[PDB]
Amino acid sequence: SGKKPVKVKTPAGKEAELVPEKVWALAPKGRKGVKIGLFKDPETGKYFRHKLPDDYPI
DNA sequence: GCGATCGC
DNA sequence: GCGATCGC
């Protein structure tokens, strides 16, 4: 689980600051990849994945 | 296509 | 079992 909030655009189309429920690195062998957060849209109650900043702690 | 994750 | 998440 994550700690600090993340500047996120929701599926519903709104800018929100949300603390991700799970975070992990998504990277192939030999390449940097990205960090991924699993988020819950507070309005709709639905889950979605979003890129995390590069320095976000896993 | 690779990489991990999980709600659906 | 997969969509969808990014950047290479």
Swiss-Prot record:
Q: What is this protein called?
A: Chromatin protein Cren7
Q: What is the effect of changing K40E?
A: Slightly reduces the melting temperature of the protein. Slightly reduces affinity for calf thymus DNA and poly(dA-dT) oligonucleotides. No significant effect on affinity for poly(dG-dC) oligonucleotide
| The family this protein is said to belong to | Belongs to the Cren7 family.
Q: Where does it localize?
A: Chromosome; Cytoplasm
Q: What is the effect of changing F39A?
A: Results in a significant protein misfolding, reduced thermostability, reduced ability to mediate DNA compaction and bridging. No effect on DNA binding and constraining DNA into negative supercoils
Q: What's in the GO CC field?
A: chromosome; cytoplasm
Q: Which residues carry this modification: N6-methyllysine?
A: K14
Q: Which UniProt keywords apply?
A: Chromosome, Cytoplasm, DNA-binding, Methylation
Q: What does this protein do?
A: A highly abundant chromatin protein, it binds double-stranded DNA without sequence specificity; there is approximately 1 Cren7 molecule for 10-12 bp of DNA. Constrains negative DNA supercoils. Induces DNA compaction and mediates intermolecular DNA bridging. Binding does not require protein methylation. Binds single-stranded DNA weakly. Increases DNA stability against thermal denaturation. Promotes formation of loose nucleoprotein structures with long DNA in the presence of albA proteins.
Oligomeric and partner information: Monomer.
Q: What is its main location?
A: cytoplasm
| Outcome when changing K22E | Slightly reduces the melting temperature of the protein. Slightly reduces affinity for calf thymus DNA and poly(dA-dT) oligonucleotides. Increases affinity for poly(dG-dC) oligonucleotide
Please indicate which superkingdom the organism of origin belongs to.
Archaea
Instruction: Please provide an example of a Pfam family that matches this protein in its UniProt record.
Output: Cren7
Q: Name one GO molecular function term.
A: double-stranded DNA binding
Q: Which InterPro entries match?
A: Cren7_sf (IPR038647), dsDNA-bd_Cren7 (IPR020906)
**PTM notes:** Methylated at multiple sites, to varying extents.
